Design an enzyme around this catalytic site. Structure first.
Site, PDB file in Angstrom:
ATOM      1  N   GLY A  44     -33.216  15.945  56.229  1.00  8.66           N
ATOM      2  CA  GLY A  44     -33.765  15.770  57.559  1.00  8.66           C
ATOM      3  C   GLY A  44     -32.987  14.921  58.554  1.00  8.66           C
ATOM      4  O   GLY A  44     -33.391  14.858  59.718  1.00  8.66           O
ATOM      5  N   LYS A  65     -27.962  16.996  59.236  1.00  7.43           N
ATOM      6  CA  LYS A  65     -26.693  17.528  58.762  1.00  7.43           C
ATOM      7  C   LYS A  65     -26.422  18.923  59.326  1.00  7.43           C
ATOM      8  O   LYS A  65     -25.393  19.153  59.954  1.00  7.43           O
ATOM      9  CB  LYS A  65     -26.677  17.581  57.231  1.00  7.43           C
ATOM     10  CG  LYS A  65     -26.667  16.219  56.565  1.00  7.43           C
ATOM     11  CD  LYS A  65     -26.679  16.323  55.044  1.00  7.43           C
ATOM     12  CE  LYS A  65     -27.930  17.047  54.528  1.00  7.43           C
ATOM     13  NZ  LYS A  65     -29.186  16.356  54.949  1.00  7.43           N
ATOM     14  N   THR A  66     -27.349  19.850  59.112  1.00  2.90           N
ATOM     15  CA  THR A  66     -27.163  21.213  59.581  1.00  2.90           C
ATOM     16  C   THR A  66     -27.045  21.345  61.096  1.00  2.90           C
ATOM     17  O   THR A  66     -26.191  22.083  61.591  1.00  2.90           O
ATOM     18  CB  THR A  66     -28.290  22.121  59.080  1.00  2.90           C
ATOM     19  OG1 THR A  66     -28.380  22.018  57.651  1.00  2.90           O
ATOM     20  CG2 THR A  66     -28.009  23.565  59.459  1.00  2.90           C
ATOM     21  N   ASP A  89     -28.102  25.085  52.257  1.00  2.00           N
ATOM     22  CA  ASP A  89     -29.475  24.625  52.031  1.00  2.00           C
ATOM     23  C   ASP A  89     -30.318  25.632  51.244  1.00  2.00           C
ATOM     24  O   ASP A  89     -30.166  26.846  51.401  1.00  2.00           O
ATOM     25  CB  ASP A  89     -30.146  24.301  53.375  1.00  2.00           C
ATOM     26  CG  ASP A  89     -29.591  23.033  54.012  1.00  2.00           C
ATOM     27  OD1 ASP A  89     -29.804  22.810  55.230  1.00  2.00           O
ATOM     28  OD2 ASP A  89     -28.940  22.257  53.278  1.00  2.00           O
TER      29      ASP A  89
HETATM   30  N1  LIG Z   1     -30.805  14.016  67.407  1.00  2.00           N
HETATM   31  C1  LIG Z   1     -31.816  14.910  67.182  1.00  2.00           C
HETATM   32  N2  LIG Z   1     -32.828  14.896  68.089  1.00  2.00           N
HETATM   33  C2  LIG Z   1     -33.909  15.678  67.971  1.00  2.00           C
HETATM   34  N3  LIG Z   1     -34.002  16.530  66.933  1.00  2.00           N
HETATM   35  C3  LIG Z   1     -32.987  16.537  66.035  1.00  2.00           C
HETATM   36  C4  LIG Z   1     -31.856  15.786  66.026  1.00  2.00           C
HETATM   37  N4  LIG Z   1     -31.105  16.090  64.900  1.00  2.00           N
HETATM   38  C5  LIG Z   1     -31.827  16.959  64.317  1.00  2.00           C
HETATM   39  N5  LIG Z   1     -32.985  17.260  64.889  1.00  2.00           N
HETATM   40  C6  LIG Z   1     -34.110  18.267  64.637  1.00  2.00           C
HETATM   41  O1  LIG Z   1     -34.476  17.824  63.328  1.00  2.00           O
HETATM   42  C7  LIG Z   1     -34.664  18.542  62.052  1.00  2.00           C
HETATM   43  C8  LIG Z   1     -33.697  17.710  61.242  1.00  2.00           C
HETATM   44  O2  LIG Z   1     -32.987  18.805  60.663  1.00  2.00           O
HETATM   45  P1  LIG Z   1     -31.536  19.336  60.305  1.00  2.00           P
HETATM   46  O3  LIG Z   1     -30.240  19.460  60.974  1.00  2.00           O
HETATM   47  O4  LIG Z   1     -31.983  20.650  59.789  1.00  2.00           O
HETATM   48  O5  LIG Z   1     -31.004  18.752  58.914  1.00  2.00           O
HETATM   49  P2  LIG Z   1     -30.658  18.298  57.486  1.00  2.00           P
HETATM   50  O6  LIG Z   1     -29.539  19.213  57.017  1.00  2.00           O
HETATM   51  O7  LIG Z   1     -30.161  16.867  57.798  1.00  2.00           O
HETATM   52  O8  LIG Z   1     -31.918  18.381  56.694  1.00  2.00           O
HETATM   53  C9  LIG Z   1     -34.652  19.873  62.803  1.00  2.00           C
HETATM   54  O9  LIG Z   1     -36.030  20.189  63.135  1.00  2.00           O
HETATM   55  C10 LIG Z   1     -33.765  19.680  64.107  1.00  2.00           C
HETATM   56  O10 LIG Z   1     -33.714  20.871  64.942  1.00  2.00           O
HETATM   57 MG   LIG Z   2     -29.906  21.102  56.405  1.00  2.00          MG
END
Ligand SMILES: Nc1ncnc2c1ncn2[C@@H]1O[C@H](COP(=O)(O)OP(=O)(O)O)[C@@H](O)[C@H]1O
Ligand SMILES: [Mg+2]
Ligand SMILES: Nc1ncnc2c1ncn2[C@@H]1O[C@H](COP(=O)(O)OP(=O)(O)OP(=O)(O)O)[C@@H](O)[C@H]1O
Ligand SMILES: [Cl-]
Ligand SMILES: [Cl-]
Ligand SMILES: [Cl-]
Ligand SMILES: [Mg+2]
Length: 550
Positions: free
Chosen positions: A18, A21-22, A45
Site C-alpha cells: 500500500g 510501489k505500483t 502483484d
Molecule cells: N501519493 C499518493 N496520493 C494519493 N494516493 C496515492 C498515492 N500513492 C498511491 N496512492 C493510491 O494508493 C493505493 C496505494 O497503492 P499502490 O501503488 O497500488 O501500491 P503498492 O504496490 O505500494 O501496494 C492506490 O489506491 C493508489 O491509487
Molecule cells: Mg502494488
C-alpha cells in the site's frame, strides 16, 4: 526527482503493502516513455491491477500499452508461479509416494517463502536475458526481492547441501529443491542486482515513524548484500497548504514534519524525494503523471461495538492478526483496556515495548527467536557440515521463524483464556499453524469459535484489504475463521474540515464496503487519531462508544 534521473536498465521499487510501489512504477514508466525511452513495466502483484489503471488487459506475455506509446507491460502472477513451482516438485512423486506424504510436502511448499523463491526465479529470468535490453532501455519492477531470499540463493550450502525432512527449522527450505536454472544464472542475477550500473533500488515510504523504521531496516539488509544504488521516495506527504483551517490536518502535517526532519540515521545519507498525497486514487495517465509534480459517513459500528460482543462470553482468547504496521498492537491494547474497564480479568500479551484489573506480559521476540534458533540447531544441524549449518541459519532467518517463536512464548499463558481474557497482538499464518500442527500447538483451541476469536486488522485501502483477505483465506485452510475485522486509520469516521482529507476519506468508501459486503462477518471502524495512541487516554478515544441494548 532524483530517482528519475539516469535510471539504469533495471529499476525496482520496494516497500510495504500500500505505500504506492505500483503507482510510482506506472508514473515512472510513463515519464520515461514520454522522454522517448522504450520501457517494460513488470507487474508482480498477486492480483495485478496495472492493466486496469491503463484501461487494458495484460498477461504473461509482453504487450504494448496502447494508451501510451513506448511503453509495454508484462504480468508475472506470483500465485500462479507458486502453483506451477509447487506442482513442478510434487507432480513427479505423485503416485510413487503415499497421499498423506505428498499432501504434507505440498503444504511445505504453500508458504510465503515458496512464493518469494518462485518470484525470484522469475526475476532471474528477466535479469539474465540480455536481448531484453536490446528491445527496451528500462525494465521496471513494482516489487523487489528481500535480502533473505538473496542470501539463501547466494549461500554455497544451498547448492551442495541437503536438510532432512524434520518438523522444525528447515520447515521453509523445501522450495530450494525447486530451482531449475543453473546455479550460475542465479548468481548472475544477484550480480545484476548488486551492480549500480544496471540496477537502481527505490525504497518507498510514508512519513511515519513506524514505517521509516522498517524501510531503514530494508535499506541496511539490501546494502550489506550488495545493492548500494538505493533511493528514498517518501509518498503521500501532506501539503502544508492544507494544515490551514482544519485541526486534524494540522496535527498530521506536524507529525510528518517531525519525522521528515528526524529521519532514521541510516536513511539520512540517501538521495530523497517526496511525493504529495493525491485527492483521488490515480486511475489514468493524467492522474498518475500528476503524482510526480513538485508542487501540490459509512454505516459501520465502532470498535466499542465489537468489544461489547467479545465481552458477552466473558472470557476467551483474542488474537489480533494482520500485516506489519496495520495497528495490531494498538488494537490489542485498546481492546484489553476497554474489556478491563468493563470489569473483566484481562491478560494482554505483546511483542513490543509500551487499572490493576489488567496485567501485561511483554515478550522480547529477539530472545525467543534465538532460544528457538538455538534449539533447532542442536536438533537438525547435528549432522550438517558448516556450509549446511549456515543454510539452516538463514532459513531460521525467515519472517516465520520469529512468528513461530513468539507464538510459542505466548502459548505459555494461553491456558488462562479459560478463566478470563487473553489478548494477543500477533499470530502465525495459516500455513505456519498447519506446519506446527504436523510437528505443542493448541490447534483445536484456535479452531474453536467459542474459545478463540481471531480479529483481522487492516486499512481502508486497496492493497491492505487484499493482503488481509489472503491472510484470512490461509487461516481458513487451517480451520480458523476470523471472527471479525478491524479497519484502522479511517478518515471517514474522523473530524476534519480539510478539503483534501475529506476527498481522501471518500476514497476509502469502496474499500470499507468491500470488507462489510465480502470479507467480514463483523466489522469495526477506527479513526485516524489526531495524536499518537500511546496513552490509555487516546487509546480509549479509539474505541468510541456503544449504547447499551437488550
Ligand atoms: N501519493 C499518493 N496520493 C494519493 N494516493 C496515492 C498515492 N500513492 C498511491 N496512492 C493510491 O494508493 C493505493 C496505494 O497503492 P499502490 O501503488 O497500488 O501500491 P503498492 O504496490 O505500494 O501496494 C492506490 O489506491 C493508489 O491509487
Ligand atoms: Mg502494488
Ligand atoms: N488509529 C490510529 N491512529 C493513529 N495512529 C495509529 C493508529 N493505529 C496505529 N497507529 C500508529 O501506527 C504505528 C503502527 O501501529 P502498531 O505498532 O500498533 O502496529 P502493528 O501492526 O502492531 O505493528 P508491527 O507489525 O510492527 O508489530 C504506531 O506507531 C501507532 O501509534
Ligand atoms: Cl513460509
Ligand atoms: Cl513455504
Ligand atoms: Cl450491551
Ligand atoms: Mg505489533
Amino acid at each position: 526527482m532524483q530517482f528519475l534521473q539516469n535510471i539504469p536498465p533495471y529499476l525496482f521499487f520496494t516497500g510495504k503493502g500500500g505505500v504506492g510501489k505500483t503507482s510510482i512504477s506506472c508514473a515512472t514508466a510513463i515519464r520515461l516513455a514520454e522522454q522517448g525511452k522504450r520501457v517494460l513495466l513488470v507487474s508482480t502483484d498477486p492480483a495485478s491491477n496495472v492493466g486496469q489503471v491503463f484501461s487494458q488487459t495484460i498477461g504473461n506475455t509482453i504487450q504494448a500499452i496502447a494508451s501510451v506509446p513506448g511503453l509495454s507491460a508484462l504480468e508475472i502472477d506470483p500465485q500462479a508461479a507458486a502453483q506451477q513451482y509447487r506442482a513442478r516438485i510434487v507432480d513427479p512423486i505423485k503416485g510413487v509416494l503415499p497421499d498423506d506424504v505428498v499432501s504434507s510436502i505440498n503444504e511445505q511448499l504453500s508458504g510465503a517463502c515458496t512464493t518469494e523463491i518462485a518470484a525470484f526465479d522469475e526475476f532471474t529470468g528477466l535479469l539474465t536475458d540480455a536481448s531484453l535490453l536490446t528491445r527496451f532501455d528500462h525494465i521496471i519492477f513494482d516489487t523487489a526481492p528481500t535480502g533473505h531470499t538473496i542470501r539463501l540463493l547466494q549461500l554455497p550450502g544451498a547448492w551442495s547441501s541437503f536438510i532432512d525432512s524434520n518438523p522444525e527449522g528447515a520447515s521453509c527450505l523445501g522450495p530450494m529443491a525447486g530451482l531449475e536454472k543453473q546455479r550460475e544464472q542465479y548468481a548472475y542475477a544477484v550480480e545484476a542486482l548488486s551492480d549500480p550500473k544496471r540496477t537502481r533500488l527505490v525504497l518507498v515510504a510514508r512519513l511515519q515513524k513506524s514505517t521509516l523504521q522498517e524501510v531503514a531496516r530494508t535499506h541496511l539488509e539490501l546494502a550489506a548484500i550488495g545493492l548500494k544504488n538505493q533511493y528514498l521516495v517518501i509518498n503521500g506527504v501532506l501539503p502544508k497548504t492544507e494544515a490551514a483551517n482544519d485541526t486534524l490536518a494540522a496535527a498530521i502535517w506536524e507529525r510528518e514534519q517531525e519525522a521528515l526532519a528526524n529521519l532514521p540515521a541510516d536513511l539520512a545519507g540517501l538521495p530523497t524525494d517526496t511525493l504529495f498525497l493525491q485527492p483521488v486514487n490515480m486511475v489514468g495517465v493524467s492522474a498518475l503523471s500528476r503524482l510526480l509534480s513538485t508542487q501540490p459517513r459509512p454505516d459501520i459500528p465502532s470498535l466499542s461495538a465489537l468489544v461489547d460482543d467479545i465481552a458477552r462470553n466473558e472470557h476467551g482468547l483474542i488474537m489480533l492478526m494482520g500485516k506489519g504496521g496495520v495497528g495490531k498492537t494498538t488494537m490489542a491494547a485498546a481492546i484489553a483496556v476497554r474489556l478491563a474497564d468493563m470489569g473483566f480479568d484481562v491478560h494482554l500479551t505483546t511483542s513490543d515495548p509500551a487499572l490493576n484489573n489488567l496485567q501485561v506480559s511483554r515478550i522480547d521476540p529477539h530472545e525467543e527467536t534465538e532460544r528457538y534458533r538455538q534449539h533447532v540447531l542442536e536438533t537438525k544441524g547435528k549432522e550438517l557440515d558448516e556450509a549446511g549449518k549456515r543454510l539452516l541459519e538463514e532459513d531460521l532467518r525467515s519472517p516465520c521463524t520469529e512468528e513461530i517463536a513468539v507464538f510459542q512464548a505466548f502459548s505459555r499463558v494461553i491456558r488462562e483464556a479459560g478463566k478470563r481474557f487473553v489478548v494477543m497482538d500477533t499470530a502465525p499464518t495459516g500455513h505456519t499453524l498447519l506446519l506446527l500442527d504436523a510437528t505443542t500447538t493448541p490447534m483445536m483451541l484456535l479452531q474453536d469459535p467459542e474459545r478463540t476469536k481471531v480479529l483481522l486488522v487492516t486499512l481502508p485501502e486497496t492493497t491492505p484489504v487484499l493482503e488481509a483477505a489472503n491472510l484470512q483465506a490461509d487461516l481458513e485452510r487451517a480451520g480458523i475463521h476470523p471472527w471479525g475485522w478491524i479497519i484502522n486509520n479511517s478518515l471517514s469516521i474522523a473530524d476534519t474540515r480539510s478539503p483534501l482529507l475529506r476527498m481522501r476519506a471518500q476514497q476509502e468508501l469502496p474499500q470499507i464496503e468491500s470488507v462489510k459486503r465480502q470479507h467480514a462477518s463483523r466489522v469495526a471502524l477506527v479513526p485516524v487519531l489526531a495524536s499518537e495512541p500511546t496513552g490509555i487516554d487516546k487509546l480509549k478515544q479509539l474505541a468510541g462508544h456503544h449504547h447499551h441494548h437488550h
